[PDB]
Ligand binder design. Structure first.
Ligand SMILES: Cc1cc2nc3c(=O)[nH]c(=O)nc-3n(C[C@H](O)[C@H](O)[C@H](O)COP(=O)(O)O)c2cc1C
Ligand SMILES: Cc1cc2nc3c(=O)[nH]c(=O)nc-3n(C[C@H](O)[C@H](O)[C@H](O)COP(=O)(O)O)c2cc1C
Ligand SMILES: Nc1ncnc2c1ncn2[C@@H]1O[C@H](COP(=O)(O)OP(=O)(O)O)[C@@H](O)[C@H]1O
Ligand SMILES: Nc1ncnc2c1ncn2[C@@H]1O[C@H](COP(=O)(O)OP(=O)(O)O)[C@@H](O)[C@H]1O
Ligand code: SF4
Ligand code: SF4
Lengths: 729, 729
């Protein structure tokens, strides 16, 4: 079944003392587990091992508590307690015949150290451009020797934990790169100035780590070969290549990236800006000068692209982070020729966003089991089979409905999925037509393909699209045992918003000079020259519409009561988005909202317009002086992006008539997705996945408990430590 | 020794079936521990129990997974794993004869549920004004019964964990208050409309909880009596007093607050805006209509104010959160008449800022042991006494040096503290003179009072202020065994900033039209009419300086290459700070920085002015189109607020001459505080505290490990559960 052209992907490659079983490599990446959630870490990486990935790597792994990333979650290899938690992972990926790697990390001032409160050290004292209140101490020669010893000690504990590959991590502008890069390194001693001096710290660390564990472990390094800032930081054909020549003999394998830390969306390229293989112009520069295996991520999901870069001599190994999150069995599907079962990463970066927010576990828009493998026992490729003949009617074929259909069908149920829309995908069909978001299609392409394939396996299963809207009676009299309502949400038409929770006087999207997103995207309702987009949403909709409208020749002003595109900080889209709105001359009026709308004009006010002093003036009167900042602005068309509401009128009717359910042999009706409450596409598809996994539980409407990975009082993290309160007195 | 006037404070008061041993009450408050850090929770509350606080409450405690505050950290009472972990705290506070309380919490859409992924429910569907992407499902009567049962179950688990006081939490606009408040509740049935219908959810929940555990536990309710938004939300003389009259027979004690969730800085009132007793005008109103014990927080630190609100009949009990964080032993000190040993909270809200950031443990600017009680065994009031007669010279009497001196003197060392300054307190003496920051003085007032006190305990110790600056020779010949350099930081004079890490061409604070923060605060140098403040710092200096100058009749523009006053989001100062700048007509030009400065004018650019498309154009040329936004703006004076640098010249010289230490019998020299790296006042204070505690360690420059509270792989959180991966197949 496998096209023999793909056979190269399954040749083994020696990395130092080790052998990769094939050319599929999961580069180090955060998942929100670290050494704190050992089951999560263990399960998420081991399912990938059984899925065929040659090597699995932890995320950035702190070598010492003065590189503590709290509030974000890194791995830590500080002590014996970590060695045991991390070993859970290496044992479990070894079980399925894969290598395990750890990415040794020291952050410099980029690590805020909010747990440890320790002082970070660096080449020169600087305030981090990422963590702008975090400063570091300039290292003296002893600081340098001590921190190099941190690396050696961590490498040894890594061998103890059972790791096969040990990185010294100099990508994303972390310590080794801070020495190499003059942007940080202002020294004038033997560690500063010339390339040879600036390369010195990394070189010395490499051979010290190699000396400590090089016999048992492959020594890899992760290198940001170009900071993509131009002259002034690392350029690939200046320092980048010359450094690779210097260090080549010490490293068993090169793992290449581009970009810095403040803008690491240049590495993890959103599909909004970057296509698969976006990194190739920089990555290939390395294989030019290296004599060792190199790999370089580039959101590779397509085996034709994978074989192109290997045979064209751009890379030897296929490095993946996100592709491996979206589909842990990518390599097995390619090997077996099941190319149409490949769940393709859509480059949305919602997995990243959870880490960036600092704390929460990762989630994935494509793969609703990511982060759920251990806590709820959900294997992405294995499904409990039903022992009964229950049919299920799903009304709504959007992200949630289509996912519930797919999982149910995989579990052997008989399902009837219906929609008024002619195509599976729900609102995602409109969203993927926004400028830049075309690859978000892959979400609904995947369920379409899977659902049509699965239909052939149960002939009682039906797909009824292009339908007439289901009614309460239609549902009651349909004869399904269970019904899942996945009818979605729409954008508010009356100015209702998270700020007031009330409509705005004069807001009415049926008026000729007011549009909703849906009206804009259907492209029928005419839009005048001067557009104002009123915004109370912090994600993609208002910026995407602004771009769309400005490139169509409108003059667009966003007046935004919330921080525009805030969530796009976390997905890493923010910087290029702002640059994009800027070059399109989109005017932004932040910290303003709307008190009333008339034809062709609206009254706006500053949200900080009230008196700063609070005085008790009794009931009936505000405790602050009045907001006096109101002014009118004109528009030709007003686009309302104020919030969404659940489309649950069908559900409500069905619930009203719950008495009749039993009469009609309906065992239960459940509400999922945006029809329950508007949410991220990722979580909409999760709800469909969850009710499908749990449809035989007592109440599939509410999730059953998941395994919790929190400390049990009475059990010390330190092997053989004392857990009780002891004062140093 | 205790003033007889203060005898009331130590009278017992009966709340339901329970008796408070005195009038000091720690209301529920976050600490970044929850049920995840059982030592931290246990240690922090019990040192307060031992300090004489009558009752100690957890922070907000989730009753169910669908009210999950991740990425922030709440307590949880979901299962038996939690009652084990939380029982650790109640056992320890019981050890000291105090009551333990728990605050049962359901948040509605305000809880983003980033761990559980569950769906919140509320009175109506709204997007949270606090979590703008978080929506809830509108409850039906079945949902309503199901959620009220969550409370009952949590209250029974609480009783099992050994809690004496069980709250139904209706403050900070959480679920019970959402039903009562028309801002959220747009219902039309018997849970909406009239006050009777609106108070229905809370009354029902109080009755069921009472019925469940009211026999064994006092039943309290924490109520936001006025949303301080005026008409449209809860007003104290309208709905507030009425609801109190309705619920009065169900509750054993009223715990009263004001304000909402988006702006609970109105509750936790910063000293920048509010004084001790600021809440009284609202709190006293509940006392008018209630027959139960009432307490209402108001940053109460002064026993004179405490007896005032009790004797005037505003409150029966003294409820404190921050005062108890800054001084766990406030009750004992008042009891014993040690009034001048009280470590007064400065109302800086840095403790809060850590919880708001989401994840990190609490820290306190006054009390360097808050958060460190369990992990490093630091009791705020007990110090290990030295066995030797070592003498320590400390140069610098700022937050770090004065804390090192204080703790060293407490431990029995001979210390010589010296500064060129006339007063103890370092840079905090300038900072406390910024508009609104006068109470930040208490940090140096406290340390001045304690050092003066400790000097009498040891004749050889010495405070020398107003001195010549210490010189490397001075230190070497001084005759101290160990030396601590605590010489601070200063604001940059050359435009060096976190964005570029380099000077700005033309930046020179020696020129007559450029000022630093110190020069403005000294007030000697002349400032012209039009002032531009160039900002690259995300905390208080720029907005405070802007306030100061604007009030003095200057025209102020802040051009800010970072998010202005970003950190004040977390300290809760931001809303009222922005209103203040607004009424002072301060112009803010965000998303801009400065390429170069000339006399009377500076060139600024948009930080998003580079082209959005990245293309490899080879070395020497930027991969983005050039920023073209540069324009010149004029000023009469330019205030530079771009960053700070360590003042470590003395340190550097001493390290250069390390070979001379031994012959001068200097056993060690240590660098602490801002001189090591610029930091928050809280952490400057901590570094001094830490070297003092660890001065006999092998290397006092670097902290020794603290106890970690992370799960140990192999130990299930669920008592009797399985920790191994198990897939449901
Ligand atoms: C959720 C997430 C977290 C990441 N954290 C890390 C990390 O800990 N260490 C690291 O070296 N890179 C980190 N990365 C970057 C990836 O290793 C990788 O370079 C990026 O995802 C681009 O590769 P892709 O296009 O194959 O996803 C992270 C990426 C993701 C998806
Ligand atoms: C660090 C911190 C976290 C807080 N979290 C809570 C909480 O979980 N529950 C609650 O009801 N109030 C919370 N608050 C508010 C306090 O209970 C209190 O009402 C507020 O700080 C004002 O009281 P004070 O002036 O005595 O500090 C918190 C306050 C602080 C200081
Ligand atoms: N009564 C109905 N009958 C059939 N399909 C319906 C009905 N009401 C809504 N739908 C469909 O439900 C789907 C909901 O999709 P979507 O909004 O994407 O929600 P989600 O994100 O929850 O999957 C839409 O394709 C819509 O056409
Ligand atoms: N050479 C010196 N001799 C004596 N005192 C000094 C010397 N250099 C600086 N100082 C003092 O050190 C103190 C530093 O305090 P501060 O800046 O508040 O630092 P921190 O916040 O680290 O405590 C200042 O009061 C300063 O006058
Ligand atoms: S969350 Fe989005 S970007 Fe991340 S792996 Fe999943 S589909 Fe890809
Ligand atoms: S951190 Fe600040 S506001 Fe909080 S308890 Fe301490 S001194 Fe008070």
């Amino acid at each position: 079944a496998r096209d023999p052209k793909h056979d190269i992907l399954f040749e083994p490659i020696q990395i130092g003392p080790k052998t990769l079983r094939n050319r599929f490599y999961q580069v180090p990446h955060c998942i929100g587990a670290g050494s704190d959630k050992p089951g999560f870490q263990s399960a998420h990486r081991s399912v990938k091992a059984e899925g065929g990935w040659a090597a699995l790597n932890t995320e950035y792994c702190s070598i010492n508590p003065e590189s503590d990333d709290t509030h974000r979650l890194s791995a830590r290899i500080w002590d014996e307690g970590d060695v045991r938690n991390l070993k859970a992972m290496t044992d479990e990926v070894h079980k399925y015949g894969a290598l395990a790697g750890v990415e040794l990390w020291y952050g410099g001032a980029h690590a805020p150290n909010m747990e440890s409160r320790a002082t970070p050290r660096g080449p020169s004292q600087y305030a981090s451009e990422f963590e702008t209140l975090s400063y570091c101490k300039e290292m003296d020669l002893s600081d340098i020797a001590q921190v190099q010893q941190f690396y050696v000690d961590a490498a040894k504990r890594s061998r103890d934990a059972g790791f096969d590959i040990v990185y010294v991590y100099g990508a994303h502008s972390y310590l080794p790169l801070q020495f190499l890069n003059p942007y940080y390194n202002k020294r004038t001693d033997k560690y500063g100035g010339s390339l040879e001096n600036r390369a010195r710290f990394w070189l010395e660390t490499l051979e010290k780590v190699k000396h400590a564990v090089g016999s048992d472990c492959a020594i890899a390094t992760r290198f940001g070969v170009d900071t993509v800032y131009g002259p002034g930081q690392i350029e690939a054909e200046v320092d980048g290549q010359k450094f690779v020549e210097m260090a080549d003999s010490l490293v068993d394998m090169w793992d290449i990236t581009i970009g810095d830390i403040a803008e690491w969306g240049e590495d993890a390229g959103p599909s909004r800006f970057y296509q698969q293989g976006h990194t190739i112009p920089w990555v290939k520069l390395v294989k030019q000068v290296s004599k060792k295996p190199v790999l370089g991520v580039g959101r590779y999901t397509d085996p034709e692209k994978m074989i192109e870069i290997v045979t064209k001599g751009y890379a030897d190994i296929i490095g993946c982070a996100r592709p491996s999150i979206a589909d842990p069995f990518l390599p097995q599907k390619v090997e077996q020729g099941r190319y149409d079962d490949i769940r393709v990463c859509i480059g949305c970066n919602v997995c990243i966003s959870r880490w960036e927010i600092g704390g929460p576990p990762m989630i994935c828009t494509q793969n609703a089991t990511a982060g759920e493998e251990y806590r709820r026992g959900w294997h992405p490729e294995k499904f409990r089979q039903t022992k009964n003949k229950d049919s299920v009617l799903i009304v709504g074929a959007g992200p949630s409905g289509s996912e519930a259909a797919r999982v149910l069908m995989e579990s052997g149920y008989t399902v009837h999925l219906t929609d008024t829309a002619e195509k599976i995908g729900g609102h995602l069909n409109q969203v993927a037509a926004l400028p830049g978001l075309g690859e978000w299609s892959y979400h609904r392409d995947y369920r379409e393909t899977q659902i049509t394939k699965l239909l052939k396996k149960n002939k009682e299963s039906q797909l009824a699209l292009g339908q007439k809207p289901m009614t309460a009676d239609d549902v009651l009299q349909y004869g399904a045992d269970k019904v899942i309502i996945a009818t979605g949400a729409r954008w508010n038409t009356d100015g209702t918003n998270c700020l007031t929770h009330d409509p705005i006087p004069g807001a009415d999207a049926s008026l000729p000079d007011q549009l909703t997103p849906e009206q804009v995207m259907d492209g029928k309702k005419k839009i005048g020259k001067r557009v104002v987009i009123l915004n109370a949403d912090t994600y993609f909709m208002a910026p995407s519409l602004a771009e769309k409208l400005a490139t169509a020749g409108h003059e667009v002003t966003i007046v935004s009561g919330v921080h525009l595109a805030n969530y796009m900080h976390f997905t890493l889209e923010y910087p290029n988005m702002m640059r994009r709105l800027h070059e399109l001359h989109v005017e932004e009026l932040g910290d303003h909202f709307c008190s009333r709308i008339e034809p062709g004009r609206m009254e706006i006010y500053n949200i900080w317009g009230d008196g700063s002093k609070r005085t008790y003036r009794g009931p009936g009167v505000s405790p602050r002086d009045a907001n006096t900042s109101h002014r009118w602005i004109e528009f030709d068309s007003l686009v309302l992006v104020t919030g969404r509401h659940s489309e649950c009128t069908l559900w409500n009717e069905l619930k009203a008539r719950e008495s009749e359910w039993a009469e009609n042999d309906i065992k239960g009706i459940y509400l999922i997705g945006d029809a329950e409450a508007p949410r991220l596409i990722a979580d909409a598809t999760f709800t469909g996945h969850r009710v499908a996994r749990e449809i035989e539980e007592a109440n599939p409407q509410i999730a059953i408990p998941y395994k919790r990975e929190t400390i049990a009082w009475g059990t010390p993290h330190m092997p053989g430590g004392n857990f009780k309160i002891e004062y140093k007195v």
